[PDB]
mmCIF file of all heavy atoms in Angstrom:
data_model
loop_
_atom_site.group_PDB
_atom_site.id
_atom_site.type_symbol
_atom_site.label_atom_id
_atom_site.label_comp_id
_atom_site.label_asym_id
_atom_site.label_seq_id
_atom_site.Cartn_x
_atom_site.Cartn_y
_atom_site.Cartn_z
ATOM 1 N N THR B 3 -40.569 3.762 -11.105
ATOM 2 C CA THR B 3 -39.273 3.709 -10.447
ATOM 3 C C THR B 3 -38.599 2.379 -10.754
ATOM 4 O O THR B 3 -39.243 1.326 -10.746
ATOM 5 C CB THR B 3 -39.415 3.907 -8.933
ATOM 6 O OG1 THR B 3 -38.136 3.773 -8.306
ATOM 7 C CG2 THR B 3 -40.389 2.900 -8.339
ATOM 8 N N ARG B 7 -35.239 -2.763 -4.582
ATOM 9 C CA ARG B 7 -34.635 -4.064 -4.348
ATOM 10 C C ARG B 7 -33.674 -3.953 -3.180
ATOM 11 O O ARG B 7 -32.926 -2.976 -3.080
ATOM 12 C CB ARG B 7 -33.895 -4.562 -5.589
ATOM 13 C CG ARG B 7 -34.779 -5.229 -6.607
ATOM 14 C CD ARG B 7 -34.094 -5.294 -7.949
ATOM 15 N NE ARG B 7 -34.252 -4.054 -8.695
ATOM 16 C CZ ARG B 7 -33.316 -3.124 -8.801
ATOM 17 N NH1 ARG B 7 -32.139 -3.261 -8.219
ATOM 18 N NH2 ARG B 7 -33.568 -2.029 -9.509
ATOM 19 N N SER B 9 -31.490 -6.776 -0.153
ATOM 20 C CA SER B 9 -31.142 -8.138 0.213
ATOM 21 C C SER B 9 -31.808 -8.513 1.535
ATOM 22 O O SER B 9 -32.722 -7.837 2.010
ATOM 23 C CB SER B 9 -29.627 -8.276 0.272
ATOM 24 O OG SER B 9 -29.260 -9.428 0.998
ATOM 25 P P U H 14 -25.759 -9.921 1.057
ATOM 26 O OP1 U H 14 -24.692 -10.239 2.029
ATOM 27 O OP2 U H 14 -27.142 -9.737 1.537
ATOM 28 O "O5'" U H 14 -25.302 -8.606 0.294
ATOM 29 C "C5'" U H 14 -23.943 -8.425 -0.056
ATOM 30 C "C4'" U H 14 -23.660 -7.031 -0.556
ATOM 31 O "O4'" U H 14 -24.211 -6.838 -1.880
ATOM 32 C "C3'" U H 14 -24.243 -5.880 0.235
ATOM 33 O "O3'" U H 14 -23.553 -5.617 1.440
ATOM 34 C "C2'" U H 14 -24.162 -4.743 -0.769
ATOM 35 O "O2'" U H 14 -22.832 -4.263 -0.865
ATOM 36 C "C1'" U H 14 -24.500 -5.469 -2.070
ATOM 37 N N1 U H 14 -25.923 -5.301 -2.427
ATOM 38 C C2 U H 14 -26.248 -4.124 -3.058
ATOM 39 O O2 U H 14 -25.419 -3.279 -3.325
ATOM 40 N N3 U H 14 -27.564 -3.961 -3.374
ATOM 41 C C4 U H 14 -28.572 -4.856 -3.118
ATOM 42 O O4 U H 14 -29.719 -4.582 -3.462
ATOM 43 C C5 U H 14 -28.160 -6.052 -2.456
ATOM 44 C C6 U H 14 -26.879 -6.232 -2.136
ATOM 45 P P G H 29 -36.927 6.379 -5.947
ATOM 46 O OP1 G H 29 -37.159 7.292 -7.083
ATOM 47 O OP2 G H 29 -37.096 4.925 -6.145
ATOM 48 O "O5'" G H 29 -35.459 6.651 -5.403
ATOM 49 C "C5'" G H 29 -35.024 7.972 -5.123
ATOM 50 C "C4'" G H 29 -33.552 8.024 -4.802
ATOM 51 O "O4'" G H 29 -33.297 7.358 -3.541
ATOM 52 C "C3'" G H 29 -32.632 7.316 -5.775
ATOM 53 O "O3'" G H 29 -32.362 8.069 -6.940
ATOM 54 C "C2'" G H 29 -31.403 7.052 -4.923
ATOM 55 O "O2'" G H 29 -30.645 8.238 -4.766
ATOM 56 C "C1'" G H 29 -32.042 6.715 -3.583
ATOM 57 N N9 G H 29 -32.248 5.264 -3.426
ATOM 58 C C8 G H 29 -33.407 4.564 -3.624
ATOM 59 N N7 G H 29 -33.279 3.287 -3.405
ATOM 60 C C5 G H 29 -31.953 3.134 -3.042
ATOM 61 C C6 G H 29 -31.226 1.975 -2.685
ATOM 62 O O6 G H 29 -31.622 0.809 -2.616
ATOM 63 N N1 G H 29 -29.905 2.262 -2.384
ATOM 64 C C2 G H 29 -29.353 3.511 -2.424
ATOM 65 N N2 G H 29 -28.060 3.617 -2.107
ATOM 66 N N3 G H 29 -30.020 4.598 -2.756
ATOM 67 C C4 G H 29 -31.306 4.340 -3.050
ATOM 68 P P G H 31 -27.976 3.485 -11.458
ATOM 69 O OP1 G H 31 -27.565 4.403 -12.544
ATOM 70 O OP2 G H 31 -29.390 3.057 -11.351
ATOM 71 O "O5'" G H 31 -27.088 2.171 -11.550
ATOM 72 C "C5'" G H 31 -27.595 0.927 -11.104
ATOM 73 C "C4'" G H 31 -26.504 0.055 -10.541
ATOM 74 O "O4'" G H 31 -26.759 -0.192 -9.135
ATOM 75 C "C3'" G H 31 -26.397 -1.334 -11.143
ATOM 76 O "O3'" G H 31 -25.681 -1.353 -12.363
ATOM 77 C "C2'" G H 31 -25.730 -2.122 -10.030
ATOM 78 O "O2'" G H 31 -24.344 -1.825 -9.979
ATOM 79 C "C1'" G H 31 -26.392 -1.510 -8.802
ATOM 80 N N9 G H 31 -27.612 -2.237 -8.411
ATOM 81 C C8 G H 31 -28.903 -1.835 -8.625
ATOM 82 N N7 G H 31 -29.782 -2.677 -8.167
ATOM 83 C C5 G H 31 -29.028 -3.697 -7.615
ATOM 84 C C6 G H 31 -29.430 -4.886 -6.966
ATOM 85 O O6 G H 31 -30.572 -5.293 -6.742
ATOM 86 N N1 G H 31 -28.344 -5.646 -6.559
ATOM 87 C C2 G H 31 -27.036 -5.297 -6.753
ATOM 88 N N2 G H 31 -26.110 -6.144 -6.296
ATOM 89 N N3 G H 31 -26.647 -4.188 -7.352
ATOM 90 C C4 G H 31 -27.688 -3.441 -7.758
#
Side-chain angles (χ1 to χ4, degrees):
Chain B
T3 177
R7 277 162 277 102
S9 162

